[PDB]
Structure formats: C-alpha cells, structure tokens
Amino acid sequence: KGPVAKRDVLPDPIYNSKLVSRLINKMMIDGKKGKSQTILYKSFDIIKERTGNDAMEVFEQALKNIMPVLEVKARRVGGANYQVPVEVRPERRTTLGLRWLVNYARLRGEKTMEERLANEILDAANNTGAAVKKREDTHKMAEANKAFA
Amino acid sequence: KVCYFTSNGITHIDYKDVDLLKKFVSERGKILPRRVTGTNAKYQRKLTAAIKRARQMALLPYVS
Amino acid sequence: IESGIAHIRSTFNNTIVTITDTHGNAISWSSAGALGFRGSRKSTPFAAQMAAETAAKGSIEHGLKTLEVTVKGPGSGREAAIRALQAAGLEVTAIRDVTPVPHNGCRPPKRRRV
RNA sequence: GGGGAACUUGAGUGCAGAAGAGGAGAGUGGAAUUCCACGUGUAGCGGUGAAAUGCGUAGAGAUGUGGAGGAACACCAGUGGCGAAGGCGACUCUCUGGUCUGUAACUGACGCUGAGGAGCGAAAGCGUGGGGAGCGAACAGGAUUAGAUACCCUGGUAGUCCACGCCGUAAACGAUGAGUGCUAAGUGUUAGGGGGUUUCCGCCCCUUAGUGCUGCAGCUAACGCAUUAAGCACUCCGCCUGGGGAGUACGGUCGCAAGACUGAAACUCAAAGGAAUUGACGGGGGCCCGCACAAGCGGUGGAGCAUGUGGUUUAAUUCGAAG
Numbered sequence: 044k045g046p047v048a049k050r051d052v053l054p055d056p057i058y059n060s061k062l063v064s065r066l067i068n069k070m071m072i073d074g075k076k077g078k079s080q081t082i083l084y085k086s087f088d089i090i091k092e093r094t095g096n097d098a099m100e101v102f103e104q105a106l107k108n109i110m111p112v113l114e115v116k117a118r119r120v121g122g123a124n125y126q127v128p129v130e131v132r133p134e135r136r137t138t139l140g141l142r143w144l145v146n147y148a149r150l151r152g153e154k155t156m157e158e159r160l161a162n163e164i165l166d167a168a169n170n171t172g173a174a175v176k177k178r179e180d181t182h183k184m185a186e187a188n189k190a191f192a
Numbered sequence: 193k194v195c196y197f198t199s200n201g202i203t204h205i206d207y208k209d210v211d212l213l214k215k216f217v218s219e220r221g222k223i224l225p226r227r228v229t230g231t232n233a234k235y236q237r238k239l240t241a242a243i244k245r246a247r248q249m250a251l252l253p254y255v256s
Numbered sequence: 257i258e259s260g261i262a263h264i265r266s267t268f269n270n271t272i273v274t275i276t277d278t279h280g281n282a283i284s285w286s287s288a289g290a291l292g293f294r295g296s297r298k299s300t301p302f303a304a305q306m307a308a309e310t311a312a313k314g315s316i317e318h319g320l321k322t323l324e325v326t327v328k329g330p331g332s333g334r335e336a337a338i339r340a341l342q343a344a345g346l347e348v349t350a351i352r353d354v355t356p357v358p359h360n361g362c363r364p365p366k367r368r369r370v
Numbered sequence: 371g372g373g374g375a376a377c378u379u380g381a382g383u384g385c386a387g388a389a390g391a392g393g394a395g396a397g398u399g400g401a402a403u404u405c406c407a408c409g410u411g412u413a414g415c416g417g418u419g420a421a422a423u424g425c426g427u428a429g430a431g432a433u434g435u436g437g438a439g440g441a442a443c444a445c446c447a448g449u450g451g452c453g454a455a456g457g458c459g460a461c462u463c464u465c466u467g468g469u470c471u472g473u474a475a476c477u478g479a480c481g482c483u484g485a486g487g488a489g490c491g492a493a494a495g496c497g498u499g500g501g502g503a504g505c506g507a508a509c510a511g512g513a514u515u516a517g518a519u520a521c522c523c524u525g526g527u528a529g530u531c532c533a534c535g536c537c538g539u540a541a542a543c544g545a546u547g548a549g550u551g552c553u554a555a556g557u558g559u560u561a562g563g564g565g566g567u568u569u570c571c572g573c574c575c576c577u578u579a580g581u582g583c584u585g586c587a588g589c590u591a592a593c594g595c596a597u598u599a600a601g602c603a604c605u606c607c608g609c610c611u612g613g614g615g616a617g618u619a620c621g622g623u624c625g626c627a628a629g630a631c632u633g634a635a636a637c638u639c640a641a642a643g644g645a646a647u648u649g650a651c652g653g654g655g656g657c658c659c660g661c662a663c664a665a666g667c668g669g670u671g672g673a674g675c676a677u678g679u680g681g682u683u684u685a686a687u688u689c690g691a692a693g
Contacts, residue, residue, distance in 0.1 A: 044659085116664095121419035123296075135665095142666090190293075190302040199571060223446045233450080233560075234389085240446045241461090247400080248461050254400045263433065269417065272432060280434025282411045287432090289414055296420075358402035359460085360442035362504040363530090369521080 062099040073145055086157040090165060105167035109140045109174050113185045127192070128185045143174040197235050205242040210251045213243055221256045257283070260320045262311065262341065262348070264304070266331035269296070271304035273311040273337060275323070284314035304333030308340030315346070324350035 054064040071079045091098040115126045148160040166172030217223050223243055226236055246252050265272045274285035286307045288298035325338055325348050341348050
C-alpha cells in the first residue's frame with residue numbers, strides 16, 4: 044500500500060485567479076455533467092443581485108466560514124469506543140466543507156435548487172447556516188473530547 | 193574496576209571513621225552498589241555492616 | 257502570602273493539586289473531578305494540566321509568587337502539571353520526588369489476575 | 371575369615387587462621403500503612419475495560435504537627451553465603467552447632483552404609499492464653515454474564531503474629547540416595563594457601579575447597595548429562611514390574627480432630643505412557659498482502675411487479691442443484 048492522489052477540474056495555468064478558476068472549472072460535485080455547469084453559474088448572478096458586490100467573494104468567504112480545523116474519529120479501546128480528536132489535511136478541509144455545503148443545499152428544501160444553494164452560500168457567508176451549524180457541533184464535540192490526543 | 197581498599201592497603205573498617213562512609217553512601221543515603229564503588233566482594237559485606245552500625249548510631253541519615 | 261508549596265499526587269486514576277504555606281498551611285486545591293472529569297479521563301495528563309492552572313488561579317489572588325513542588329506516586333500527570341505551573345506564569349523553584357517508599361512496610365494487596 | 375607384630379595414605383586429635391541470612395534468648399532502631407486529636411482546607415475522594423457499591427457539608431480526601439499500636443527489615447543483594455533438609459536476610463549483645471584452609475605434633479584402620487528405632491520436618495490445620503497494623507479464606511454489597519455460588523470493585527470474620535503443645539504432609543525437585551577411586555579442556559565467581567617482579571599497589575603461575583556456564587571421550591530411545599556424570603567401577607540402603615478399579619475398600623498403628631502410614635480384591639481395557647517428527651490450530655509472537663477494513667459513491671431489504679427457491683397444494687405440480 045501507499046499514498047495516492049490526483050488532480051483534475053484544472054483551470055488554465057497562467058493569468059488565472061480563483062474566480063475564473065471556478066467560472067471555467069472546479070467544484071460541480073453534484074452529479075453527472077449538465078445539471079451542473081448549469082443550476083450553477085446562475086446561482087452566482089442571483090446573488091450578484093442579492094448583494095451589491097462581486098458574487099464570487101461571498102463564495103469563498105462563506106467557504107472560510109464553513110472550514111473546520113479539527114474533527115474527531117472513532118477508535119476501539121477497551122469497551123468505551125473513545126472519540127479521538129485529530130486534525131484535518133489541507134485538502135481534506137476543502138473536500139469535506141464543500142461536501143457539507145452541497146448536501147445541505149439539497150437537504151434544506153425550498154422551491155428549487157439554485158435558490159436553495161445561493162441562500163445557503165449567504166447563510167454561510169453570514170455565520171448562521173445549517174452547514175456552519177454542523178461545523179460548530181463537530182468543533183464543540185472535538186474540544187470537549189480534546190483530552191485524548 | 194579500581195578497588196579502593198586493596199589499592200590503599202587498609203584492613204577492617206574501624207567503624208568510627210565516618211569520613212569515607214559518606215563517599216561510599218549516595219547523597220540520597222542509599223548505599224552504593226558494587227557496580228559503582230568497585231570495591232572487593234569480601235569487604236563489601238563488612239562495609240554495609242559498618243554503615244548500618246553508624247546509621248543506627250545516627251552518624252549517617254536513613255534518608256537525605 | 258508570597259511563597260508556598262504545591263503538592264500534586266500522580267496516581268493512575270486521578271491527579272490532585274494542592275498548595276500550602278511553608279508552615280504547612282493550605283490555601284486552595286483542585287482536581288480533575290473538581291473540574292468535571294468523572295471517568296478514566298481524570299487520569300489523562302490533560303486533566304492534571306487543567307488542574308494546574310486552576311490551582312494557579314486560586315493562588316494568585318492571595319498573592320503568592322514562588323513555589324516548589326512535591327510529586328507523589330507514579331502517573332501520567334508527572335510532567336504535565338509541573339510545566340503547566342510555569343505556563344500559568346508562576347515560578348517553581350524546585351522539584352521534589354517524594355513518594356512513600358517503605359523499606360518493607362505492609363504486605364501489599366493481592367494480585368489483579370487471580 | 372581367626373590370632374599376633376608393623377606402618378600411615380583412610381579416619382580423627384592438637385596448632386594458626388578464615389568465612390558465613392547456621393541455630394536459640396534478650397533488648398534496640400528507620401521509612402511506611404492504619405487509627406486518633408489538633409491547624410489549614412472546599413467539593414468531591416476512591417475505584418475499573420467502561421461503571422457501580424463505598425467514604426464526604428455531622429466538613430471528606432488533601433495537607434502540617436503530635437501520639438497509639440502491631441507486621442516486615444528497602445540499596446547493600448550477587449544463578450552470593452550458611453545449613454543434612456525444611457529453611458535462614460535491620461542492629462547489638464548472651465549462649466551455641468558445623469565447615470574450609472596450612473600443618474605433620476599426635477592415635478594408628480578407630481572406616482562406609484544402615485531395615486526396624488529416635489529426632490527434626492514449609493504452609494495450611496488443631497488446643498490453651500495473649501495480640502491484631504496491613505493482608506485476607508468464609509460472608510455481604512456493587513459490577514460482568516443468559517446464568518456467575520467466580521475472574522473485577524468496596525468492605526470484611528477466621529487465619530496471618532507471639533508462648534507452649536499436637537499433625538507429620540508438599541512438584542519436601544537437581545522430578546537424580548549415601549560413601550570411595552579414576553577419566554580431555556575452556557571459562558566465570560566465593561573462602562583460602564604457596565610462589566615469581568616489591569615485604570608498594572596490581573600482573574601472572576601453581577594450588578585446595580565450594581558454587582555456576584560451555585564442551586571431548588563415554589553414556590543416552592530423544593532430550594541431554596559430561597570431575598557438582600545421567601561416564602568407568604565397588605560396598606550399603608530404599609523403591610519399580612501394564613492402565614483403571616484406588617492410595618479407595620477392610621483390619622490394624624498413630625491423631626482430640628482433620629487426617630497420616632501400612633495397603634487387597636472382584637470387575638474391566640488393549641492399550642495407558644516418554645521423547646522426538648511432520649501438518650493443523652491459538653482470544654501466541656514478528657513480518658507482508660488483498661474494495662478486507664477505513665475514507666467516498668450508489669444500492670439491498672419499506673411498496674408494486676419480473677424471475678428462482680422453501681413450504682403448502684394438488685391428479686401431476688417432471689427431476690437435478692442446497693453456506
């Protein structure tokens with residue numbers, strides 16, 4: 044066995060910012076192609092309308108808000124199944140936070156997908172959202188069991 | 193490896209001589225073992241006899 | 257109340273912390289159970305570390321600066337709390353490894369696997 | 371074999387040293403555990419894989435003092451030493467046993483073994499009188515479990531200790547009886563003695579007696595033992611003759627008792643066993659692998675239907691397949 048990894052959804056190499064990185068590539072982890080690259084790219088403009096600024100900035104601001112920095116896994120010891128706090132790798136951070144946004148977007152429930160997702164992006168740009176809610180529950184769980192190393 | 197008593201050629205302890213007993217007990221009051229004092233096996237038992245006698249006589253502490 | 261002595265027991269289940277005066281007069285104390293650890297978690301070094309700074313906080317407001325610590329029994333809390341003291345801003349002048357070591361004492365309890 | 375006269379190597383005595391938890395009696399001392407009173411002292415302490423019983427606001431635990439007691443003597447401590455064996459470790463003293471070394475002054479075979487007999491003989495156990503800190507059968511409570519009369523936790527009676535008697539057993543083992551002589555070495559270590567350089571230290575060579583570790587020949591069925599023989603030999607004693615039945619039954623001798631020693635049989639089986647060999651397996655160890663597990667996706671069973679199987683059903687529901 045051994046470590047393994049890959050990269051994809053790559054934007055262009057040079058003169059590339061994160062905003063156009065996503066405006067041409069990235070994320071889209073909702074299903075097959077189509078119904079993504081669509082039901083998206085339009086979520087951003089509705090929040091260009093809903094906020095008087097660049098609709099991208101709120102995206103990674105809400106992302107920063109959702110990012111955890113500790114979490115906890117399960118280990119078998121004696122007969123207790125202690126919950127052991129651990130850290131998060133730089134890529135594990137992004138994948139899991141993005142995952143939380145997408146799954147809660149498809150859980151919350153309103154008229155339709157793109158307004159659902161946009162409302163959560165702003166509810167995570169502000170620090171009152173469902174995904175952020177799970178973020179602080181994982182966090183309080185973790186440093187409530189900080190003792191276990 | 194160096195054997196202090198046979199090196200300096202001295203006979204039995206003469207327990208009153210409390211000066212070298214400090215050197216042969218640790219600062220904690222623990223009596224040092226052969227592995228560190230390097231003294232001869234026959235003399236070590238009469239050593240611990242002498243230290244025990246003087247310890248009872250309160251010339252060396254039981255614990256420091 | 258400038259100088260004192262901090263005593264900590266390092267057991268396999270708990271770690272108590274208590275401070276006293278050179279005249280052997282207590283001021284304040286703390287413990288893993290005092291803080292809220294109930295199970296085996298009391299034995300963790302973290303619990304003793306927490307105990308250390310609550311003891312320090314109960315110490316400062318009475319105005320004691322210099323300490324020297326006596327540790328009793330073997331346990332994981334040996335290293336945690338002692339450096340937690342200086343992490344709490346205090347100054348511990350000596351470390352004393354005083355534990356009851358009987359020459360023969362009393363016959364210990366039976367074995368754990370019979 | 372008997373008798374007489376020698377002799378000294380065997381066996382002892384004397385002489386000079388050496389060592390030792392060798393034994394019995396008296397006293398003495400240090401760290402602790404517990405309890406008690408006292409100061410300070412807030413909220414839990416204790417405990418296990420988690421927990422719980424327990425102890426605490428009637429102030430615990432913790433922490434600083436002072437007492438009270440009973441048990442064992444930390445490091446020194448070492449496959450070290452002593453003892454015939456059980457066993458024997460703090461210190462001092464009183465009494466007392468045995469051993470080794472060098473001698474050559476003494477006696478001159480005074481030696482070995484030993485059925486019965488006698489005495490010792492760990493721990494538990496018993497009797498009398500004390501003592502009782504801790505530990506702790508029994509016993510209670512709390513856990514675990516389907517159950518748990520246990521493993522775990524909190525208590526805790528008898529015992530554990532002392533004086534005098536009794537029992538006479540242990541895997542009382544080196545699972546190897548005692549004594550004597552001979553048979554390659556190497557290597558530690560304990561108590562000595564002699565010598566070569568110094569009567570300095572410490573360097574080495576011989577040398578007895580122990581006490582380990584490797585290793586020839588030899589023995590061994592294999593392991594392995596191998597000058598501390600399980601080798602080569604001689605004396606004396608004890609013990610064995612297939613496994614159960616059974617160290618039980620009966621009868622005796624002991625014991626207050628528990629029980630101990632002596633110790634059949636009928637019946638029944640063709641095996642029971644020792645050591646080594648190869649696989650298997652372990653809630654054994656050391657490595658390594660696999661969508662094996664983690665880390666993700668989407669599913670199965672909840673509904674309807676398609677199909678296969680079990681059951682039932684028939685006249686037949688053709689037979690085969692069954693982790």
